[PDB]
Amino acid sequence: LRSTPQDELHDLLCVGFGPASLAIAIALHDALDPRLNKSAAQPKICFLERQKQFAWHSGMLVPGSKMQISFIKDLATLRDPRSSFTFLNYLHQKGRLIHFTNLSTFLPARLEFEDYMRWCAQQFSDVVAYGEEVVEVIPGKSDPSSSVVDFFTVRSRNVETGEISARRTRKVVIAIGGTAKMPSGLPQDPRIIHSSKYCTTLPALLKDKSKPYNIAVLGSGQSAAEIFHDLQKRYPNSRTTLIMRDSAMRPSDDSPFVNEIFNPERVDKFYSQSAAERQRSLLADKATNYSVVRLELIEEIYNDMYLQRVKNPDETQWQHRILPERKITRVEHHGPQSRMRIHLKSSKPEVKETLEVDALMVATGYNRNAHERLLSKVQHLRPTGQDQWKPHRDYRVEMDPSKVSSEAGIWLQGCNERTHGLSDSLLSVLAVRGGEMVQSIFGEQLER
Amino acid sequence: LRSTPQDELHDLLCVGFGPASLAIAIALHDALDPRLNKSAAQPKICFLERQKQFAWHSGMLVPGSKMQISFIKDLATLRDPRSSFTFLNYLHQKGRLIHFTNLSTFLPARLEFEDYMRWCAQQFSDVVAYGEEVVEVIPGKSDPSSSVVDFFTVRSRNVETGEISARRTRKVVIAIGGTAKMPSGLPQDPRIIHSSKYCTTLPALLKDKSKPYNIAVLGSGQSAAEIFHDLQKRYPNSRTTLIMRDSAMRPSDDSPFVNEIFNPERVDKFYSQSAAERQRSLLADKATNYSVVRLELIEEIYNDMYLQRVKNPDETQWQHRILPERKITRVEHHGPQSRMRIHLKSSKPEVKETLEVDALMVATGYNRNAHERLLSKVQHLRPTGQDQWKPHRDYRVEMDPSKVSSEAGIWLQGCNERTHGLSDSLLSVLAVRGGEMVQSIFGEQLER
Amino acid sequence: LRSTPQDELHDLLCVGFGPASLAIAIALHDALDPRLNKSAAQPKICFLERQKQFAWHSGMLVPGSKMQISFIKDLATLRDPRSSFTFLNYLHQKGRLIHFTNLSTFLPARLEFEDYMRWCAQQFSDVVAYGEEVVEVIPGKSDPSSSVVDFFTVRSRNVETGEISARRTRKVVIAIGGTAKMPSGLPQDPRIIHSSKYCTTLPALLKDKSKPYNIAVLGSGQSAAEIFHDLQKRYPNSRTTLIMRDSAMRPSDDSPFVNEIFNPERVDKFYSQSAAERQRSLLADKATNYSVVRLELIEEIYNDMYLQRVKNPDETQWQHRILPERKITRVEHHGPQSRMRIHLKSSKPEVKETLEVDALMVATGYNRNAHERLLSKVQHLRPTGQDQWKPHRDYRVEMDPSKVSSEAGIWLQGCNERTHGLSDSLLSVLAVRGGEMVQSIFGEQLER
Amino acid sequence: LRSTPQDELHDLLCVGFGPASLAIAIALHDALDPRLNKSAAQPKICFLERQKQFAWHSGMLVPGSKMQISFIKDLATLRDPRSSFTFLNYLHQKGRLIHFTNLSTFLPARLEFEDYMRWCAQQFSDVVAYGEEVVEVIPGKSDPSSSVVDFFTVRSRNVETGEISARRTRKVVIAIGGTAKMPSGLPQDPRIIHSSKYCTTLPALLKDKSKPYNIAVLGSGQSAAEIFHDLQKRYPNSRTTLIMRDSAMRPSDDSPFVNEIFNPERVDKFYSQSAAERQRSLLADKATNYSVVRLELIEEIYNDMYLQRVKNPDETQWQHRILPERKITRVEHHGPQSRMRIHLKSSKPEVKETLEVDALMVATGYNRNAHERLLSKVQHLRPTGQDQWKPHRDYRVEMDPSKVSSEAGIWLQGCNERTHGLSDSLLSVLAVRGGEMVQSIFGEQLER
Numbered sequence A, B, C, D: 001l002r003s004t005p006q007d008e009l010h011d012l013l014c015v016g017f018g019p020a021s022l023a024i025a026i027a028l029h030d031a032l033d034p035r036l037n038k039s040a041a042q043p044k045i046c047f048l049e050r051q052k053q054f055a056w057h058s059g060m061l062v063p064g065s066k067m068q069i070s071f072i073k074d075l076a077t078l079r080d081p082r083s084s085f086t087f088l089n090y091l092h093q094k095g096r097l098i099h100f101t102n103l104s105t106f107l108p109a110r111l112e113f114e115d116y117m118r119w120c121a122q123q124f125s126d127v128v129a130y131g132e133e134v135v136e137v138i139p140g141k142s143d144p145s146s147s148v149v150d151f152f153t154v155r156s157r158n159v160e161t162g163e164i165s166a167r168r169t170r171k172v173v174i175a176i177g178g179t180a181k182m183p184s185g186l187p188q189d190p191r192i193i194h195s196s197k198y199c200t201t202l203p204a205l206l207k208d209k210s211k212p213y214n215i216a217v218l219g220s221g222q223s224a225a226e227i228f229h230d231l232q233k234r235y236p237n238s239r240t241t242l243i244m245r246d247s248a249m250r251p252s253d254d255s256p257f258v259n260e261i262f263n264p265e266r267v268d269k270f271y272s273q274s275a276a277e278r279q280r281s282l283l284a285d286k287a288t289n290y291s292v293v294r295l296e297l298i299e300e301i302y303n304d305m306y307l308q309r310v311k312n313p314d315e316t317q318w319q320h321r322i323l324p325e326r327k328i329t330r331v332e333h334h335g336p337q338s339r340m341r342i343h344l345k346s347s348k349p350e351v352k353e354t355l356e357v358d359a360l361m362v363a364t365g366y367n368r369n370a371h372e373r374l375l376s377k378v379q380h381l382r383p384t385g386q387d388q389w390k391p392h393r394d395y396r397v398e399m400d401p402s403k404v405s406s407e408a409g410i411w412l413q414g415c416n417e418r419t420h421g422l423s424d425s426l427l428s429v430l431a432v433r434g435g436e437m438v439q440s441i442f443g444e445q446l447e448r
Ligand SMILES: Cc1cc2nc3c(=O)[nH]c(=O)nc-3n(C[C@H](O)[C@H](O)[C@H](O)COP(=O)(O)OP(=O)(O)OC[C@H]3O[C@@H](n4cnc5c(N)ncnc54)[C@H](O)[C@@H]3O)c2cc1C
Pocket: A015, A016, A017, A018, A019, A020, A021, A048, A049, A050, A051, A056, A057, A060, A066, A067, A068, A069, A132, A133, A134, A135, A175, A176, A177, A178, A413, A414, A425, A426, A427, A428
């Protein structure tokens, strides 16, 4: 794709260049390829990224981490396996395809799947601005005296300098993913770090890999266990503690009949379900994604735990402990020492031990309400009284017909789980979704 | 153990000779063995069985069925691995121990684990009366003019003849397991059979294994899937239908941290938990037992399902279908034909297809309220106003100190899940429980 | 590809339309596709098949049989994953790609992989003649008075009618695969059937699936075990016997470091090795292919074997027996009965039991010397004294420069294991090989 | 068992207190136990150990190492699962039996299986002399003027002091296991260490775990891979090289039909086989034990190898390399540097790279000819001309009837593979063998 001057009115502007946005670029590429598309000027497009270059959750690129989805659900295959942008094609291009096969694995390393996506991302370098974090989407009318909005202005603070530029577009896509979630009862402290910053910020706080540190992990999801399992290797002399409110780490559900809610086609049937059944579906199918660990990592962790029992039959004296059904009441981070003091209570409804730590990893997951801050200026374009954005099946936010021109729009991606299903936040349907997105955004063009 | 004349007052009488009762016999055996017990007249004991000989759920001994618990949790090992009555010893005695090892399996076939238990059961043939189904436990006072109950009479209808005999005992144990549960909206019909009668009664109704029958299964638990998976093999020309109210068959949870609620020691900690936390524990740990299928059988079933898709892309035309999220509203069993008519509806809250079948297997699980009918005569011995039996930690039912002598008692087994945990109904703690039972029942004796 | 009139001189004629020939068609297709090839009249080509339509070893399409190679080593992916003719693309076209993924298997069913290949084969129906079995390749000179051979005539007996036609070509490819191998000490009998005819001919001999037959299997390779394992299901009342000269069925070796001899690139390094090292390589790497069973099927078979031991501790009285280290000395097939008599001896170097059977399946593998019969007329074109065809790296048979024009040639496929390695007879390198073949055959054309 | 004064004539003296000797102690214990044996003065017995306390290959107790045999083939179960000395009983005694079960593993850690055996070994501390390494077995005649030998003197150098004591016995057992094997073309050097000394001596040579060392491993068996896989963890900055003469690391064969040669009963049938068939059996069943790695560790190692390819596509620049089909011609260990220089050649029959290393681990396996040195004084008691010890089925060495009294003997253990089979050197039949040994040695006593 060719670059568009900043000054010009774009056909489409995307906020975020993670997997979801990247899949749109790919599908737009493919739709325009006469090789893959017998039908096939070029659309004027731009992607804006807070990061200085493409990375995929670098703060959680723990050594040994695997991806949790089949390599077949890559960025292109499910829409079209002929596509240039498939995992297998990427592998072939690196000279690794015969070698990957010999693993007989469906689950590449996280590190490798990032490079596949980085290899995709580099081919849209003409149309992606990096280090540009979007601070607001603002309505605009080509006819200032008229009462009709037909474009949107999107402004971003430069990460390096701080300068704010603007780029005008008819259509907007917010694919920003998630923001780190932090329990409200936790104080602000450099010792207190969220899982998303584990690889990037913990090495600078605990600079000595040799030192007898005390480290704690709050959580029982996938992040929790990866960190907890990594701490034993990365800090061999540390005493690690895993605090969780549940009784146990629970296996993630990938069973073939359950796993079909992740089918691209099921999105239509899911969307069509009532709110009662959607709330019901997500709550029953919870263990496909949330607060669950991969079985193999549970078994790996348990087996380490058992090894300690062979060495010492007294559990309180182990190096690496698990404390189930505990909440945190007080944190003391003003004591003169290098170690802050964590107070614990039974997570059961109606005073346990007190821990001293050099760091606290909080692996409490992610929220997905980040678009609100960007769209508050655009809130007055909804139907009267509507205090929440309503996404349609094509992902366009319902707006007011008399206030917004049909050419103008805003789509959301990765936040629509409550309307589209458990696959929305994930990699599952990105190939097909991207293709569908190219259909709603550019479909006027692509028909002629 | 030596036999006791019918006429005499027993130290202990057990209703039921399934695994739970059998484990008590074993533990009593072991406690009295000077080889295993340096401490060691013989207690006067009797077991009463409805069945004519020991069998372990023969109506569900489906070809290929595996047991779902480690062979280590056999009837004796966890109390004492030296015991004569371990699985490995049984295997050694059959000349199969070197051979079993080569399987490298923890899960014997159901058929084989029955023979192990049948091999145990045959060694108490002196003290077990078969074909004797217990119809009531009745209080008795050695001093008729006194207001104190010190024994219990237990009467049983002979399965062959119908005659009723009685046997007096100081202590009683009700280990009767479960009774088949049947949805109330289902009519009484020979075509309608519960999973517990699948192997024993379905061959007599559908006598021709060749014939193009239509068979249906109601359920999504382990019984459901075994029957459903067996129907394809046992009736090759039949059209099978699996009806379930859930969206999908769900994997059973055997993950190492979760599976620790099944630890013998955890029973104490569980018992000590409040009612709020117990209700909470069982509901969160649900998938360790109820409404769940073994992962391997789900995968086996799915893969068969996929094979059909390779043959025909039209799902309505498959031989073996799954109908998810459907309830049954009407059953028509008065039509002139060999086939009764099943009407279905969405199990979702607010009219689908109508099925015609030659048989309906209902795999709707088991209830465990069967002791009430036997204990209603004994209900007036509880504390004032108590309308439910309260089991203590040792499993003795709380009674009235001023109405019942300390020598006299009643214990329950396999119904106390609500107070003892998910392991109660199962094989998990039987070795240790039996040993504990021998401690409460015979512990006065065994101290001297 | 467009059809060529019979009368005209072809650029290339292939004998056989199995996987190897089919991969050449595919690679030729791809080389000529401007979509996949920016470089891209059409070559005049023809494939001649003995079978009336494409099938892939239909006589061994046993129920439940899996393929033994990754689906990635399909007919196109390793040359180019973008290709229209990949497994994943085929699946996508059938609407099964999301469904196949949920299996999380690398090994499709044999039945399914045949349909994938049948789906490929149908797209060259213009250039493939079916029911045409090739009986000889014959030299021809455009200049009869000259001493130079520049074309070859290829004649085939019509399977339906018997008529013999001829088609002239400059280049020839013999990709006929293998012929059934039969021990010389076995007499000719309809009761004696080779594994390759198991599905197609055994049902007509043993017409009653109910009947208490005695069936025997000679062999210990993959064919042996599939038949043996299938007999128990397909004939439930039969007594099956597996005779083998080895002590045991041995696991096939798919271990990642060993499995790299199957890498496309390794063919060059293998070809370059001396005869001493090649003989050495194939003999050490034997268990990657020959006389070996898949581990899972060994375990499946063993576990069935153990089930019988639980039922009867006497091994001679089992329904399904294995007789290790036995050879067959006499066969008696002239007795009046329906059952011929098999005499056995220790396969050990220096009289055991005698079996009576209704059928004998011989699973003794395949030879690959079938091209000789077709090429005997062409033998005088080799270098003086050369009594064996020498294949080059590009697979062209070395011939005499002064007797054969450079435009004229003969290539071999699937028989060159002794020079190309264990992957030659298999599906391993077909994608890449086909592409390489298109390079040697059509490379003059494709450069311009 | 009670201690015997040094001065007295013993019934039995064992050289070695590893698993084999320890199993004899256990079986003797069990035979004498009236609990396990209704039949049951005590035999006068002594075990002599070079080590200061019981350890099981401590120099190869690599972190993470698993045992390669089922826990069922422990020291007692296969003879009698009731025995006090079973693994499951040991676990129960440690309070780990419920916990071990939750692993659902048949293969305990090496570290744990050592503690089980150490827990056995501690119960014969009365009859085991530690730090006593046996230097010779010497004939003795109670009647010096007679020509009949009826006892043996056994002398041992004290490891601490050097003093030599003697103990007289009628019967002797040499269960010394194996001695480290070293290629003859390797020079004597502290940098050159055999796998058996890896954990115990390499930490003292390479004292800094941080330092960028170059380390090499010669071998492709289990020892090779464990060391190679451990080096990456234990020395994170080292460059490791695995040199092997084979093309690849090969999977160990544990397949159920093959694995039956390890059956206790098969020893009789094996022993009875001719020398031609024995040589044949061991050579065909080679991969059950020798020059083979566990599949999981091969896959683990391969996957690490692949991870490097994702980081760098140039193989020569990887940190951890495998060099297949290479032999070592010259070693240079006189250069001034800390690094000696290794020269390599193709292991193929008819000059490659030269490596520089700080250490060389040689994992070239074990020989088992160590008894000769101890028995040379006893050689004149064999039949005329016999220059090799012949073990009988009961393991007694054939001797001369006219020179040796029937009360006097010598048994061998763990060296008799050539006559008893692949299980001899291993843990497979120790339970049963020990019991059989107690039968031949003490059977006169135990009948009365
Ligand atoms: C550690 C981890 C591993 C995961 N792996 C799996 C897996 O195995 N399989 C799977 O299917 N899913 C997994 N996921 C779920 C994950 O949400 C998706 O895989 C995927 O990241 C979805 O990407 P996205 O399009 O939501 O964008 P995200 O990856 O969430 O990132 C959006 C991008 O927009 C940028 N951005 C944010 N705000 C702004 C702004 N104001 N202006 C400009 N740019 C902005 C961000 O920096 C980022 O580059 C994982 C999640 C985590 C935390």
